[model samples]
Target: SSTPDGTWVKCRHDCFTKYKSCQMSDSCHDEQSCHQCHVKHTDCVNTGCP
Candidate 1:
């Protein structure tokens, strides 16, 4: 069942997963740097996972 809502939900999950992994990495050392990951994740969800 590949519905539109399902796809959107999946996309949001993927974005969060990416953000979480980014935060776990060494590069996300500070709040400011990790904030970028959050921003990117928001953009991903807003832009329909582009």
Candidate 2:
């Protein structure tokens, strides 16, 4: 048994890392994709732990 807050934070960090990876990629245009990444990250952060 673990704390929800810890899981929540871990989710947030995972989203952030994904977002960063999206931003770092140069193969595809990141302008609009970056926005999508941010939106996904925000959604993940707001979802909280199950």
Candidate 3:
């Protein structure tokens, strides 16, 4: 498991959606999908530190 498995953008989708039109994909970016799914968004962060 020494490979970069892409970053993840987890948020209050099932929660924030109650506020804005957010949405995102599993391709390692964006949390706005949760909005459009309901538009909100993502925050670039590093989760690849061990």
- Candidate 1: Cα lDDT at 33: 88
Per-residue alpha-carbon lDDT of model 2 for 1-50, expressed as tens digits?
Answer: 96557766787788778667767766227567777767766776667422
For model 1, residues 1-50, the per-residue Cα lDDT tens digits are 65667777888898889888889878598888899888878897778565
Clashing pairs in 2: none
The C-alpha local distance difference test score for the whole of candidate 3 amounts to 0.32
Poorly placed runs, candidate 1 (over 4 Å): 1-4
| lDDT leader | 1
lDDT of 3 by residue, 8-35 (tens): 2233332343334223334224444443
Per-model TM against the reference: 0.74, 0.56, 0.17
2 versus 3: better lDDT goes to: 2
lDDT value, residue 17 of candidate 3: 37
Off by over 4 Å in 2: 1-4, 27-30, 46-50
| Model 2 weakest lDDT span, ten residues long | 22-31
lDDT of model 2 at position 26: 62
Off by over 4 Å in 3: 1-11, 21-50
Better of 1 and 2 by TM-score: 1
Please report how far candidate 1 places residue 20 from its true position, in Å: 0.6
